[PDB]
Amino acid sequence: NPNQMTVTPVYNGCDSGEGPQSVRGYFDAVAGENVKYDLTYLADTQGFTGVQCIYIDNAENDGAFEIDVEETGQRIKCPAGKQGYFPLLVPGRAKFVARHLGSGKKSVPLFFLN
Amino acid sequence: QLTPAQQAALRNQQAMAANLQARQIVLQQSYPVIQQVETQTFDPANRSVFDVTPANVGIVKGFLVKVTAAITNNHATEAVALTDFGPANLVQRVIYYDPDNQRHTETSGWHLHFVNTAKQGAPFLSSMVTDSPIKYGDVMNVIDAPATIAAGATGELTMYYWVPLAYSETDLTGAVLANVPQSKQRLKLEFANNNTAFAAVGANPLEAIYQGAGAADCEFEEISYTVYQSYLDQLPVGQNGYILPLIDLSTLYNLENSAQAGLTPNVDFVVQYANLYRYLSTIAVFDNGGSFNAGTDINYLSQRTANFSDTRKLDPKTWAAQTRRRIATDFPKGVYYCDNRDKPIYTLQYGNVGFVVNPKTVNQNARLLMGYEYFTSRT
Amino acid sequence: QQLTPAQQAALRNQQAMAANLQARQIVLQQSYPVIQQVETQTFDPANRSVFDVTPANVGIVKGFLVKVTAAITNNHATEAVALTDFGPANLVQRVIYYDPDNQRHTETSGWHLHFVNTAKQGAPFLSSMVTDSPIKYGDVMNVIDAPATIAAGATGELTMYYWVPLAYSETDLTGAVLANVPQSKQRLKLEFANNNTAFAAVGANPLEAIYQGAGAADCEFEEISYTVYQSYLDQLPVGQNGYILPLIDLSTLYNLENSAQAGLTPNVDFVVQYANLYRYLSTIAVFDNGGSFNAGTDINYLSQRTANFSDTRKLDPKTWAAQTRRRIATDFPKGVYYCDNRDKPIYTLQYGNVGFVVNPKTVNQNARLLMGYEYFTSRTELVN
Amino acid sequence: VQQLTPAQQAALRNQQAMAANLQARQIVLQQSYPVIQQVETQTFDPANRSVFDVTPANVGIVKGFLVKVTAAITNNHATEAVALTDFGPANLVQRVIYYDPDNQRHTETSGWHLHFVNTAKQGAPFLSSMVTDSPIKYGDVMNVIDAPATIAAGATGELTMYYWVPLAYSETDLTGAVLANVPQSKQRLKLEFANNNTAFAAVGANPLEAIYQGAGAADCEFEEISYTVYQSYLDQLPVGQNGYILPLIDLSTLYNLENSAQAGLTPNVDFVVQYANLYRYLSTIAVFDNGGSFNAGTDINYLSQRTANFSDTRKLDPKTWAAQTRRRIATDFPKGVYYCDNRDKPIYTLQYGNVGFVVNPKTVNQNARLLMGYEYFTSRTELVNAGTIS
């Protein structure tokens, strides 16, 4: 009742184990990042570096936090507002790209650098 | 006597016995209640995500979500036909958060629907066909969808989903106490839209409702939902206030799904169980690059423990036979089910366990969509 | 000690309940079930349609299985008739049972009794389920059967079965009737359909009819036959005082009854109060909308409500139907609504007056709700 | 005043023995884990052989065997087709016999009787797919038990059949289960399959044991048959201060299915098939093979179970008898096949023939007979010793 409303969850702020995560590339289709992380995982800020690919960097938070990550150019340190339920969305607007994202388990650099 | 171990076993038994007694008393003394929480009619072209706010009352067992829709095929000449999941794809995702903002279930409409069927022991809310001359049958169209929607037409589909908190009507494990002022309940429903509901010929039909040569010109006219909240009303009161099964109400029960890739012909593809959870059931959907086959692309399926020891390594038809004993029919093409209700998969009880699929054929973009039903208790 | 009469009487119960259950368990573990034919008769309902069957007085009687067959001929020159929604369930119009003390138990319509038989089975009563099995299981024996249509000039054959219960189930003897004795006669009375009730003209109310169509006026039964089988327990265990018998079970009545309620108006809550003291196990509501039977489209919602205006299950028609699909694996015929209260029977005096509610969206002339109840209830006591 | 009564169940037992047995069973189930494992697969041509002796694995407590059978049948006739008989693929296995490690036989019956019991125990046609109005595409997707309704002249049909050979009564009742601890004395699961002489019936011939019948039958043949046996057992066999913790009543009781044939039927005369003593009969199946004709009750006046004090405990017309069966399997068994459930109160005579199964036939053709099928419990023997030193 009394909608619309939104209710969100986040691991932003606590860190029971520091960690790093790696890999991922694509060209014209929608790329998906599914996390199955019950044994070794944490939710963290992500760092997206676009190197020679100067198409858009795309960041998709899950259904609980609808963050649109806007990127163009050289990389930076970003803080996602992730959902506690696991999710990952990614999209690149350029063709034939290297995405080398950094999934951080630990609260992170809140700015953007070239 | 009995020493240390025996202390902890005795405690476990006093706790288990106390729980069961409390459950029995709640069931005999209380009162059920199922009441509408919210209804809305909309065009998914305008909005497809809704955050429903359940009422905070007593112990919450779950939500029955009624979903109706009208779809029009405006293609000049071509029809569309239901996909294997059809109306089960009217809801793309469902996520529930309790008053402490702890997330419980977070899964797809199709996975939730398959679990609803597994728990019923037959296709969920279906009407069985019999020779009875008395006119029983599909009278009320509880779950229903026109097979096709022609260019220029509007169809009315109906679908129901039960979003569980409590495991069942008698096992509250999973029930919700909605006796903590402050802490409210959150039910997010993400519905299908024109992009997800219609698949062109040759496209992957996994998340779609209809597929066919007329897909590009199909549009929802509207979708409507009504959420009913379920409740065990008139709780019994005793000298300590409400008589409540404390273990039941502080234990969770969730459904979740994920996608795994990396399959290659004749090689065992192993999906490890993400250890600590007590896995009650596992659903594996072999999305073979958009193709869904009736077992012909699989050599065998199995559940294996750290040892290389298989507890049920079966050819596809025999695997299907076990499922026919559970739901009186087969799940749709490429959908495989495994019941572990009486002895939940629980690593730390017997090493790492994995769900295994050894594929006979592997197309491009092949993957296994895994759906789990599990408890995650005091530990 | 202080004797709290109320607390004590309850205690006395609690011991009564335990004694009853133990006696039931012992009876079930120790007698042997028997089902035997009591009477068979073949007749033309144009001659006689009411029969008083006399059950045999032996042991504890659990119920009666009544087999009914019939041949119907459509002699219309050109028009056919088609089964109504209830069809062969209307071969028996009414059934009434009286025990040896002449206490009446069930008294209801054939259609209501049949719907309860289905509810208790968890599927259409004695039906044959359709499957993909290549082995030739199926409708082999035509246990309950009737042709969908009877064309002008044709004769159709029908078979129908009804279970008239005394005992609640095979394991719960509540409602059973006690034959260690002397007593009277029950009077299993069967009132059958005849040419007047079985055939409805186009536009007429099909509620009580078996066939409806343009050929109705020229339809006639050729014959009806019934065979009553009595199910009972023989070789009753004997102990110390005599027969070991569940006294509460045998002094409780398990009955089915039906009635008609009128006074419906659009968008207004039509409330049918539960008639107090009985422990209502199930409720069936048939919305006979002036001869029209609709699949929920003439109803806004249905509910069960208690004296505070508090609804325990106020549901739209499809959701109400969903609950029923969980009980009988399909839907009851158009306009027939079911409500299961078996585990927690509706019992006023436990929580104020309760009512069954229907808020109609459309109300035609001569609209009414036909209510069918399944209940136990016994005596009741109290004091200051 | 019917007999026998339950006071002879108590008089027949030591409640200490039964109490212990049951407790031990529960500990084993709790401390055991269920396993279903392939033990053997084989493909062959019925023209060369059709009888096989499968050797189960000697591990833990064996509950039963799931037997998968597939076959390809070619109708080589020039122009005539054949159609499934009433039993169809249920006749892919003609007979089954199981011998335990102690050389004691348990089940010895026909494939069709075994299949009908599988159905009775499931409460619906065994491993069938029920039809519903669900728009979601559940249904006969996997063809678990399947066979073409007809095989036209020149065509080849593919069939699949499954049978569950039980040792244990159910998943929760281990009565009849077999302790096979790996000590090397072998079990024997004997299977006799259909062949080119039993699978095809000519028009006018008795179709009882056949899979297909029709004008092209003489020219039908098996291209091949394949079977896979899966063994279901309980593992992590318990050990205590006595050694193996084992239930003794369960393992000294036998849960068997057996068949027999009786002849001598005469119109309007009670034909009585006596039950033997000692056995606790859980169910009875009677097939009225009326000289090759199988009718839907029209050749029978009534069926009953009779005894020996009361008279009949359930003398019923064929349709009413069928009604009781519809409550058990949600449909009717095939034409001429009659079922009787006595699970809650097993037929147990103490004297031979105290109780009989009755069929009073309306019409009796030449070579008429009743093919009986029984499910029963009967006691074998147990002791508590083993050793091993190395």
Side-chain angles (χ1 to χ4, degrees), chain A, chain B, chain C residues 1-379 381-384, chain D residues 1-8 10-390:
Chain A
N1 289 4
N3 288 4
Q4 304 179 25
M5 287 173 180
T6 306
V7 48
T8 306
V10 49
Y11 292 97
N12 291 4
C14 298
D15 295 3
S16 72
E18 292 180 19
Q21 301 181 25
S22 83
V23 66
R24 313 174 175 180
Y26 298 95
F27 299 83
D28 295 2
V30 48
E33 287 180 19
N34 291 4
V35 52
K36 290 185 189 179
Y37 300 94
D38 293 3
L39 298 62
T40 313
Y41 303 93
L42 294 62
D44 292 2
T45 304
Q46 301 180 25
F48 295 84
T49 305
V51 53
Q52 304 176 25
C53 294
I54 305 173
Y55 292 96
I56 302 174
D57 286 5
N58 290 4
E60 290 180 19
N61 292 1
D62 293 2
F65 295 85
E66 292 179 19
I67 301 174
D68 287 4
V69 49
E70 288 182 19
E71 294 178 19
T72 304
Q74 302 179 25
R75 299 179 175 180
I76 301 175
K77 295 184 189 179
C78 297
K82 295 182 189 179
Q83 299 180 25
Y85 291 98
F86 297 84
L88 296 62
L89 296 63
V90 51
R93 298 180 175 180
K95 295 184 189 179
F96 299 83
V97 51
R99 290 181 175 180
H100 292 285
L101 296 62
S103 70
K105 294 184 189 179
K106 306 180 189 179
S107 76
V108 56
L110 295 63
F111 298 83
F112 296 84
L113 293 63
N114 289 4
Chain B
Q1 301 179 25
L2 294 63
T3 307
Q6 301 179 25
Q7 303 179 25
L10 296 62
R11 294 180 175 180
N12 290 4
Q13 303 179 25
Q14 299 180 25
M16 285 293 297
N19 182 68
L20 178 54
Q21 179 187 68
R23 181 197 295 172
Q24 302 178 313
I25 286 173
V26 161
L27 293 174
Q28 308 201 69
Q29 299 299 310
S30 67
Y31 196 82
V33 172
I34 182 166
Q35 65 179 50
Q36 175 169 316
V37 167
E38 170 175 309
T39 301
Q40 205 157 339
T41 298
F42 61 95
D43 182 330
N46 293 335
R47 181 187 175 194
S48 63
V49 179
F50 295 78
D51 189 322
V52 181
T53 300
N56 282 340
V57 178
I59 292 172
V60 187
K61 293 149 63 188
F63 308 87
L64 183 61
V65 185
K66 174 186 184 183
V67 185
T68 63
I71 288 170
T72 295
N73 175 354
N74 286 309
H75 191 91
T77 61
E78 308 284 355
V80 289
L82 282 173
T83 56
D84 291 351
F85 295 4
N89 276 331
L90 272 167
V91 164
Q92 290 285 290
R93 298 183 38 179
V94 177
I95 311 91
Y96 173 85
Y97 296 84
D98 62 32
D100 297 313
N101 204 47
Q102 165 59 257
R103 198 197 63 178
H104 292 229
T105 283
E106 165 139 30
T107 199
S108 59
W110 59 259
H111 177 222
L112 176 61
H113 168 64
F114 289 151
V115 170
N116 287 165
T117 286
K119 302 269 291 290
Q120 180 170 322
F124 189 63
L125 299 183
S126 60
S127 171
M128 175 186 51
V129 176
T130 82
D131 74 338
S132 188
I134 288 97
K135 305 199 181 179
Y136 295 97
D138 175 14
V139 172
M140 294 295 298
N141 286 287
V142 178
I143 288 187
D144 164 64
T148 60
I149 297 181
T154 296
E156 299 291 337
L157 330 216
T158 304
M159 181 64 193
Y160 278 82
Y161 302 87
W162 167 254
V163 182
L165 292 187
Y167 182 66
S168 70
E169 290 296 305
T170 58
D171 182 344
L172 299 178
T173 301
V176 171
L177 180 60
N179 52 39
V180 175
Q182 262 203 51
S183 187
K184 68 177 195 300
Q185 322 169 42
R186 257 185 213 278
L187 180 61
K188 296 183 61 175
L189 300 172
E190 306 187 357
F191 293 91
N193 58 26
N194 295 340
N195 296 329
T196 71
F198 312 114
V201 173
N204 193 331
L206 176 68
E207 301 299 334
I209 301 172
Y210 284 93
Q211 174 169 47
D217 293 307
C218 285
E219 293 176 273
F220 275 103
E221 293 288 11
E222 62 163 42
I223 292 181
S224 185
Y225 71 76
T226 298
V227 173
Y228 288 92
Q229 186 173 319
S230 184
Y231 76 102
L232 252 237
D233 219 4
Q234 297 195 36
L235 302 179
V237 179
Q239 304 179 25
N240 292 2
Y242 289 151
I243 293 174
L244 308 166
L246 299 175
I247 300 179
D248 283 8
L249 303 172
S250 60
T251 300
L252 306 179
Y253 164 49
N254 307 336
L255 274 66
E256 288 197 69
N257 70 304
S258 54
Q260 309 299 317
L263 297 112
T264 59
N266 307 126
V267 176
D268 282 359
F269 189 70
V270 182
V271 184
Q272 293 291 310
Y273 282 89
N275 290 4
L276 288 56
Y277 291 167
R278 296 141 63 187
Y279 299 85
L280 304 160
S281 83
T282 302
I283 284 178
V285 180
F286 189 8
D287 168 11
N288 209 348
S291 287
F292 294 81
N293 300 301
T296 58
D297 52 3
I298 295 176
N299 292 307
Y300 59 77
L301 301 87
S302 187
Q303 274 189 317
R304 173 182 302 166
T305 62
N307 286 4
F308 296 83
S309 185
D310 298 282
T311 54
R312 53 175 292 164
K313 177 180 166 193
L314 315 168
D315 65 87
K317 274 201 184 185
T318 302
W319 182 281
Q322 308 304 317
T323 287
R324 283 198 181 192
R325 296 279 290 189
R326 303 295 186 177
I327 62 161
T329 187
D330 303 318
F331 276 103
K333 293 187 306 183
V335 181
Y336 303 94
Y337 175 71
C338 189
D339 178 325
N340 291 294
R341 300 176 190 286
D342 288 344
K343 293 178 185 300
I345 295 302
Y346 182 53
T347 64
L348 301 185
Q349 192 182 71
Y350 35 48
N352 313 300
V353 181
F355 183 88
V356 184
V357 175
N358 184 303
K360 174 182 178 175
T361 305
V362 181
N363 303 318
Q364 177 170 298
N365 297 315
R367 58 181 178 167
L368 281 193
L369 307 172
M370 307 298 298
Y372 306 101
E373 197 183 333
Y374 69 79
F375 286 150
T376 193
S377 71
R378 300 179 175 180
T379 305
Chain C
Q1 299 181 25
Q2 297 180 25
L3 294 63
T4 302
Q7 300 180 25
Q8 302 179 25
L11 294 63
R12 296 180 175 180
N13 289 4
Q14 206 184 316
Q15 300 168 61
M17 285 293 297
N20 182 68
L21 178 54
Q22 179 188 68
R24 181 197 295 172
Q25 302 177 313
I26 286 173
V27 161
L28 293 174
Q29 308 201 70
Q30 299 299 310
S31 67
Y32 195 77
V34 174
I35 182 168
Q36 61 176 55
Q37 175 169 316
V38 167
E39 170 175 309
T40 301
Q41 205 157 339
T42 298
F43 61 95
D44 182 330
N47 294 334
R48 181 187 175 194
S49 63
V50 179
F51 295 78
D52 189 322
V53 181
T54 300
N57 282 340
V58 178
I60 292 172
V61 187
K62 292 149 63 188
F64 308 87
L65 183 61
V66 185
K67 174 186 184 183
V68 185
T69 62
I72 288 170
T73 295
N74 175 354
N75 287 309
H76 191 91
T78 61
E79 308 284 355
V81 288
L83 283 173
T84 56
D85 291 351
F86 295 3
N90 276 331
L91 272 167
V92 164
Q93 290 285 290
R94 298 183 38 179
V95 177
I96 311 91
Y97 173 85
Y98 296 84
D99 62 32
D101 297 313
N102 204 47
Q103 165 59 258
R104 198 197 63 178
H105 291 229
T106 283
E107 165 139 30
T108 199
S109 59
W111 59 259
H112 177 222
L113 176 61
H114 168 63
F115 290 151
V116 170
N117 286 165
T118 286
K120 302 269 291 290
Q121 180 170 323
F125 189 63
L126 299 183
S127 60
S128 171
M129 175 186 51
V130 176
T131 82
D132 74 338
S133 188
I135 288 97
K136 305 198 180 179
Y137 295 97
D139 175 13
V140 172
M141 294 295 298
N142 286 286
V143 178
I144 288 187
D145 164 64
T149 60
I150 298 181
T155 296
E157 299 291 337
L158 330 216
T159 304
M160 181 64 193
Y161 278 82
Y162 302 86
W163 167 254
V164 182
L166 292 187
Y168 182 66
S169 70
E170 290 297 304
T171 58
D172 182 344
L173 299 178
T174 301
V177 171
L178 180 60
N180 49 41
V181 263
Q183 303 179 25
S184 102
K185 66 189 204 297
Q186 306 162 63
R187 289 172 190 275
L188 177 62
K189 296 183 61 175
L190 300 172
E191 307 187 357
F192 293 91
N194 58 25
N195 295 340
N196 296 329
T197 71
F199 312 114
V202 174
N205 193 331
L207 176 67
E208 301 299 334
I210 301 172
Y211 283 93
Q212 174 169 48
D218 293 307
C219 285
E220 292 176 273
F221 275 102
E222 293 288 11
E223 62 163 42
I224 292 181
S225 185
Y226 71 76
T227 298
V228 173
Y229 286 93
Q230 184 173 319
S231 174
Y232 62 93
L233 302 177
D234 218 4
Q235 290 188 47
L236 300 180
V238 179
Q240 303 179 25
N241 285 4
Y243 289 151
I244 293 174
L245 308 166
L247 299 174
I248 299 179
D249 283 8
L250 304 172
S251 60
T252 300
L253 306 179
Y254 165 49
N255 308 336
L256 274 66
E257 288 197 69
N258 70 305
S259 54
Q261 309 299 317
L264 297 112
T265 59
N267 307 126
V268 176
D269 282 359
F270 189 70
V271 182
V272 184
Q273 293 291 310
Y274 282 89
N276 291 3
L277 288 55
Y278 291 167
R279 295 141 63 187
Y280 299 85
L281 304 160
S282 83
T283 302
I284 284 178
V286 180
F287 189 8
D288 168 12
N289 209 348
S292 287
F293 294 81
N294 300 301
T297 59
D298 52 3
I299 295 176
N300 292 307
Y301 59 78
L302 301 87
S303 187
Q304 274 189 317
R305 173 182 302 166
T306 62
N308 290 4
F309 298 83
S310 185
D311 298 282
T312 54
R313 53 175 292 164
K314 176 180 166 193
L315 314 168
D316 65 88
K318 275 201 184 185
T319 302
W320 182 281
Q323 308 304 317
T324 287
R325 283 198 180 192
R326 296 279 290 189
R327 303 295 186 177
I328 62 161
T330 187
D331 302 318
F332 276 103
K334 293 187 306 183
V336 181
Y337 303 94
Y338 175 71
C339 189
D340 178 326
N341 291 294
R342 300 176 190 286
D343 288 344
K344 292 178 185 300
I346 295 302
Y347 182 53
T348 64
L349 301 185
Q350 192 182 71
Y351 35 48
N353 313 300
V354 181
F356 183 88
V357 184
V358 175
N359 184 303
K361 174 182 178 175
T362 305
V363 181
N364 303 318
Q365 177 170 298
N366 297 315
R368 58 181 178 167
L369 282 192
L370 306 172
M371 307 298 298
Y373 306 101
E374 197 183 333
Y375 69 79
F376 286 150
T377 304
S378 75
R379 298 179 175 180
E381 298 178 19
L382 299 61
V383 51
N384 296 2
Chain D
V1 48
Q2 302 180 25
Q3 299 180 25
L4 297 63
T5 304
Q8 303 179 25
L12 297 62
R13 299 178 175 180
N14 284 5
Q15 296 181 25
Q16 315 183 310
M18 301 194 83
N21 178 75
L22 179 52
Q23 177 185 299
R25 178 196 296 170
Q26 310 215 49
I27 294 179
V28 163
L29 292 172
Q30 169 186 55
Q31 294 297 306
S32 65
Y33 196 87
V35 179
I36 185 172
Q37 175 190 314
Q38 177 170 311
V39 293
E40 185 173 309
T41 298
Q42 183 144 43
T43 308
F44 65 96
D45 186 322
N48 293 324
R49 185 167 185 176
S50 52
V51 173
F52 298 81
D53 182 306
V54 172
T55 303
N58 280 176
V59 54
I61 290 173
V62 189
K63 301 187 294 168
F65 303 92
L66 182 64
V67 185
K68 178 186 179 179
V69 186
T70 56
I73 289 173
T74 299
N75 181 347
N76 178 221
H77 193 92
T79 70
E80 300 290 7
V82 291
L84 285 175
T85 55
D86 289 352
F87 296 3
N91 278 327
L92 272 164
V93 164
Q94 288 283 283
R95 298 170 61 169
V96 178
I97 306 175
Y98 173 85
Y99 291 84
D100 65 32
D102 292 332
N103 187 208
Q104 168 66 58
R105 274 186 304 204
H106 292 231
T107 285
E108 168 144 7
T109 196
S110 62
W112 59 256
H113 174 226
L114 177 62
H115 167 63
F116 290 151
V117 168
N118 283 167
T119 286
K121 298 273 290 293
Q122 183 173 321
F126 188 64
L127 296 183
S128 62
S129 167
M130 170 184 60
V131 177
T132 82
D133 74 338
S134 190
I136 291 95
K137 304 194 181 182
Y138 296 98
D140 174 17
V141 174
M142 295 295 298
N143 292 286
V144 176
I145 285 185
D146 172 55
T150 61
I151 293 177
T156 291
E158 295 287 351
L159 292 69
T160 302
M161 183 62 193
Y162 280 82
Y163 301 88
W164 168 256
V165 181
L167 291 189
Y169 181 70
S170 67
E171 292 297 300
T172 62
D173 184 338
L174 301 180
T175 302
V178 169
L179 187 59
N181 298 359
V182 53
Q184 304 178 25
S185 200
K186 78 170 184 178
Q187 288 166 263
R188 282 170 281 162
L189 176 60
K190 298 184 179 290
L191 302 170
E192 177 182 16
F193 296 88
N195 57 52
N196 295 316
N197 292 147
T198 70
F200 319 107
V203 177
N206 195 323
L208 174 71
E209 314 289 358
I211 302 176
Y212 285 91
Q213 172 166 53
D219 296 309
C220 285
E221 67 182 288
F222 280 99
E223 168 179 8
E224 68 169 23
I225 294 180
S226 180
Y227 70 80
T228 292
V229 175
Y230 286 94
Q231 181 171 324
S232 165
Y233 61 96
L234 304 172
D235 211 339
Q236 287 272 287
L237 258 241
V239 180
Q241 293 181 30
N242 286 4
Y244 278 161
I245 296 177
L246 304 167
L248 300 180
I249 300 182
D250 287 4
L251 302 173
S252 67
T253 303
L254 306 175
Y255 166 51
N256 308 342
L257 310 208
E258 277 202 73
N259 61 335
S260 67
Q262 310 267 312
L265 293 116
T266 313
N268 307 310
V269 171
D270 284 358
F271 187 69
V272 186
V273 183
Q274 299 176 66
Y275 284 91
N277 48 52
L278 168 64
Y279 293 179
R280 311 204 288 294
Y281 299 85
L282 305 163
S283 82
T284 301
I285 282 174
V287 177
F288 188 11
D289 167 13
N290 210 345
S293 289
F294 294 80
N295 303 299
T298 49
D299 54 1
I300 297 179
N301 286 308
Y302 60 80
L303 300 90
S304 185
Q305 275 184 322
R306 172 167 310 151
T307 53
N309 292 3
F310 294 84
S311 177
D312 319 67
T313 55
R314 54 179 288 171
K315 178 180 174 180
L316 310 170
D317 63 88
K319 278 200 174 193
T320 302
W321 182 278
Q324 313 305 310
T325 289
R326 285 203 179 188
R327 299 276 291 185
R328 305 296 182 178
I329 64 159
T331 187
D332 301 320
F333 274 102
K335 294 186 301 179
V337 180
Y338 304 92
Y339 175 73
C340 188
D341 176 326
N342 293 295
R343 298 176 193 285
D344 292 320
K345 289 179 176 299
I347 300 298
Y348 189 56
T349 64
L350 295 63
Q351 298 180 25
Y352 197 99
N354 292 3
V355 181
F357 184 88
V358 186
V359 170
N360 184 300
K362 190 184 301 291
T363 72
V364 182
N365 301 321
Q366 297 289 68
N367 298 314
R369 55 180 179 168
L370 285 194
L371 303 159
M372 308 300 298
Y374 307 97
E375 258 183 274
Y376 65 80
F377 284 149
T378 194
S379 66
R380 285 169 180 279
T381 311
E382 297 175 19
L383 292 65
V384 52
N385 295 3
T388 305
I389 300 175
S390 66

